[PDB]
Amino acid sequence: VQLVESGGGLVQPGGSRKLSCSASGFAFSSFGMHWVRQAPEKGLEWVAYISSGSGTIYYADTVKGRFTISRDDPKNTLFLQMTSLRSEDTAMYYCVRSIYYYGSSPFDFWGQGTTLTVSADIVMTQATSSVPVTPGESVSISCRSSKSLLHSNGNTYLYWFLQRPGQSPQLLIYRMSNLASGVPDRFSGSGSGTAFTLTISRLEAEDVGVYYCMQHLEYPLTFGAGTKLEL
Amino acid sequence: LSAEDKAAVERSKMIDALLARERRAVRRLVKILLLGADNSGKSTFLKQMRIIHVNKGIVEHDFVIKKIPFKMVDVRQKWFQCFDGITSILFMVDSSDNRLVESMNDFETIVNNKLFFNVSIILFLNKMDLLVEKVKTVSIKKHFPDFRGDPHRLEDVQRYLVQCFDRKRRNRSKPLFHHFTTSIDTENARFIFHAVKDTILQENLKDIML
Amino acid sequence: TASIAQARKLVEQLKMEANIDRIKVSKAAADLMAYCEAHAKEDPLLTPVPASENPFR
Amino acid sequence: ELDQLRQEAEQLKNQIRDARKACADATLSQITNNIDPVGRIQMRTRRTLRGHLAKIYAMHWGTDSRLLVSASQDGKLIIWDSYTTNKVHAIPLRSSWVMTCAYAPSGNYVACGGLDNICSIYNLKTREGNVRVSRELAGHTGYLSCCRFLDDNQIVTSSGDTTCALWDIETGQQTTTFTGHTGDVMSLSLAPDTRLFVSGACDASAKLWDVREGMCRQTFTGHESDINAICFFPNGNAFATGSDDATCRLFDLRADQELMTYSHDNIICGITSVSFSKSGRLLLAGYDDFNCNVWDALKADRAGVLAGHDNRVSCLGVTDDGMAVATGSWDSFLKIWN
Amino acid sequence: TSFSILMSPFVPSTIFPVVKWITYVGLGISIGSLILCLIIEALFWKQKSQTSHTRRICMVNIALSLLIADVWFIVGATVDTTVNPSGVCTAAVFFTHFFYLSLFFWMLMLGILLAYRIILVFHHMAQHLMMAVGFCLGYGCPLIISVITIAVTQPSNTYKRKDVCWLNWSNGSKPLLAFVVPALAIVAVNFVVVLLVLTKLATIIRVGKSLLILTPLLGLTWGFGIGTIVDSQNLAWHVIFALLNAFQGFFILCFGILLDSKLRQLLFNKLS
């Protein structure tokens, strides 16, 4: 699979831009697509979403009617039409695949991203910004939920993501409990409505980096600050 | 429903949309099984029909005569379970035959099958030129009180043969659309189309009670 | 030739089948009843569960 | 010389018949005439899974008791969410004549096949996001009547060439070929321990086979016509066969003979599917009289009826959790009953 | 009074002591018969394609319209006209009108069904579109036409008669045309359709069976009113019309339903 994003660079305040995402190696038309923000030194925020079949479109509060998400399936391209950008939009944008059927793994493949420089909501609180850790020892991270993520379906729509230094995020836990494909089984997670914890047995190198938490209980998707595991 | 079930329902609605598309395509497609020991006749008719309308095991053939989708299946008690969405059965029987006994045994087996109760039957008689050739050098079948006229004009011979396939039928009210077939293909396609159309008209009216 | 081989195969298969130990019908019937009564409280088609625990209600 | 082998076969058949008689001291009906009647079991349609464009020939449940695969003459294979009546997947097939479907016990794979002679194994879990033909297992001469999974890597099939086969999926070769049937093999069922399996085969016989050995362990008969359905009692020591003579029957592997026969005088229609409930007290039999009946498996009584199909009930299945029974008929409808 | 009042500008007087009775007695059995219809189908409708389904839809709708229209006419026979400047009498006239035109337009829907499956035999439109068109024309046309009729005729008080609660006309504004013009027109097309079906069919046995099973369901009989309208003093058109059209519910039960072999078998097996 591959999602190569293009369209970055420098834009003066105001103005417009058009980020494109070339998908290659998977059935684009069966997937939802999310656009996910990451501030220059900060955590990562959600932007927009287009569904399979372009039927439904969702946005964040800071971009509604300001950005537009579209997809051109036959060419396998996802577009973000950005209008009236401001100095707060400066961020790295990632195209995040998603698929929604029973047992699917949304937010699984994250693109390499493109750099754009510009010259109520469910609150999830990260316990701590950084943790001293040492290889071989089990570690735990936690976030708090301002709103019970256990929906009546029985699934707790919570996500844990990992971004290594300088790379694109990789899904680690979906729905608070399940592991993603390509993730070692030493990762595990648990919790309940209003508090949850990620547990790693035998943390090693390349497990360094930032762990983020997202809710998918109800758009908008809100992200935590993420804890940094530093050796 | 909340934030993942809505998306799943969208996915299911899309799959329903695709399935409805293919039902629209399919419900117009009528099926004509092919049978008979005349393999050469089967091949010749298939080639002529595809030439007009296109321009191992079961060997399907898809084409369209007059904007009407034909699927000639061209094939056993278990196979026929899968074949009751069909609108006719053809038998490729060579008129110049013995082989008439073999063909009519096969036709007797196929004609009265319960799964084919609502299926019309077309008997395609092949090589009538060869039939008149074997009429000139009379081949006499003397095993039935129908030799009366056997060493005579071709018409009596044809009538006897067509009766022989009328013979061994036990579920009538859907007549056998007998044809005397030659090497010209347009009339062959016309025969097939007209027979299938009459079958569907009769079924519609009988099930609407006139 | 082929008939001889087929008959030999059938004879061998019957021979292998006849030498199988069999239990009484009454004991097997008792075992079946034991299974059906042992799991009677966990069978939601025999004993319907309340609607609150039912996923299809 | 041939007469010698034929007479030896007849003598051995007589020994088998006599030994089976010698163990028939008492019947299941004489032992369960004192047990409580199962009662008026009438469960309703909870879901009506519709969307298929033609007749459904097979359905199969998941081990999670929620997902459901169905193969139809459409050339399609739909994976449904039974709880929500969602379509998880639609798999278009290279041949519209699919007679069987299987759902892998881990949920990764499904399988189909039919008059196309070839057993098609589909991968559901691909990073490309599409179900794709993970293998086409070739080697049968006739139609593929039923296909069943043991683990993700091997699958048992039965054909209309009087032959079953245990395939290793990675290599595509018959790791074992189960021969011995004299007719078209229609329905096979696996033991829950997944070491033995039985086959029903339009020759008035079903057979218990060992998978690791390839030999027909036992041969059961008694039906007068085609055994068109088969299923294990949920512990691997009894199974039940339905047939075109309108009679279900229950066999015990250890007793090597029948225990109880389920026939009603007003049912002159053939049997298209059989399944047991979780505990084995209910036996569901799909019939050609547009109906599906529920039998007290220990008393031969009719517990109830799942009326409500407008044509033949060609398939049925019971969940691993026992909540639901799902029936599929030639009216393009698949219905969940609880 | 007489059933002929549904279409007749004048009813000859010398016939009332008979035709009236005939009218009412017919309505009786018709109403009763129609009840049985809505019972009989409810007993055996659920016991194979778009064909039978759309025919049963039209049969049930037609039996429904005739049952309520017959009841409405019998109640309108007892409602005066000189004591209700507005209210119950115009309500009975309009309900009779809209519901009889409902009957006739559902009957046209069935006729166009037959013609459509003769001509466009290799053509399919979905069941939901079929039902949508059937309800849009079978019920929509009488609502539109009767609303226009009452709205245009109410201010001048020609909409109702001076004798019975039905449409009047006096060589000026002609409210009766709001029924005669539609009704017979449907009938006219049906006659043509029947001939086309008579073209496509034991030949004479089938022809007789078709004509008899199709005439009371497509409303050929309501075609006698033409004479009753063309030459009202024929004195004998009122007897034919009453004897044939009032019993149209009796005909629907005895012919439109009870000639179906599957229905006969189901009735015999389940009811007795």
Author numbering:
A (entry chain C): 2 to 120, 124 to 235
B (entry chain A): 12 to 66, 205 to 224, 231 to 252, 264 to 376
C (entry chain E): 6 to 62
D (entry chain B): 3 to 340
E (entry chain R): 567 to 613, 616 to 769, 784 to 854
Quote the study on this structure:
For G12 and G13 complex assembling, we swapped the “GGSGG” linker of mini-G1219 or the alpha-helical domain (AHD) of G13 with the AHD of Gi, a strategy that has been successfully used in the assembling the type 1 bradykinin receptor (B1R)/Gq complex. In addition, we substituted the N-terminus of G12 and G13 with the first 18 residues of Gi to render their abilities to bind scFv16, a fab fragment that has been successfully used in stabilizing receptor/G-protein complex. The Gq, Gs and G13 complexes have the best overall map, while the Gi and G12 complexes have relative weaker density map on helix 8 (H8) and the intracellular side of TM1-2 of receptor. The G12/receptor engagement is mainly mediated by the hydrophobic interaction between αH5 of Gα12 and TM5, TM6, TM3, TM7 and ICL1-2 of the receptor. The overall interaction is leaning toward the TM5, TM6 and TM3 side of receptor, with fewer interaction with TM7 and no connection with H8. On the αH5 side, L367G.H5.16, L371G.H5.20, L376G.H5.25, I374G.H5.23 (for convenience of comparison we use the generic numbering of GPCR database for Gα subunit), form key hydrophobic interactions with L7695.61, I6863.58 and I7956.44. In addition, M375G.H5.24, at the top of αH5, interact with L8417.60. We also observe several polar interactions that positioning αH5 for receptor engagement, including the side chain of R6232.42 forms a hydrogen bond with the carboxyl group of I374G.H5.23, T6192.45 forms hydrogen bond with N370G.H5.19 and a salt bridge interaction between K616ICL1 and E369G.H5.18. On the back view (viewing from TM3, TM4 side), F690ICL2 of ICL2 forms a major hydrophobic interaction with the hydrophobic pocket formed by I366G.H5.15, V362G.H5.11, F359G.H5.08, I217G.S3.01 and V41G.hns.01, a phenomenon has been seen in many other GPCR/G-protein complexes. Mutation of F690 ICL2 to alanine cause a dramatic decrease of receptor activity in the reporter assay, indicating the importance of this hydrophobic interaction for receptor/G12 engagement.
GPR110, also known as ADGRF1, is an aGPCR that plays a key role in neurite growth and synaptogenesis in the cortical neurons. A general activation mechanism of aGPCR involves the removal of the GAIN domain through an autoproteolysis process which generates a short peptide called stalk peptide right before the transmembrane domain, then the stalk peptide inserts into the ligand binding pocket of the receptor and activates receptor in model called “self-activation by tethered agonist”. In this work, we report cryo-EM structures of GPR110 in complex with Gq, Gs, Gi, G12 and G13 and systematically compare all major G-protein couplings in one receptor which revealed undisclosed information of G-protein coupling. The global structures of the GPR110/G-protein complexes resemble most of class A GPCR/G-protein complex, in which the G protein use the αH5 of Gα to engage the intracellular cavity of receptor.
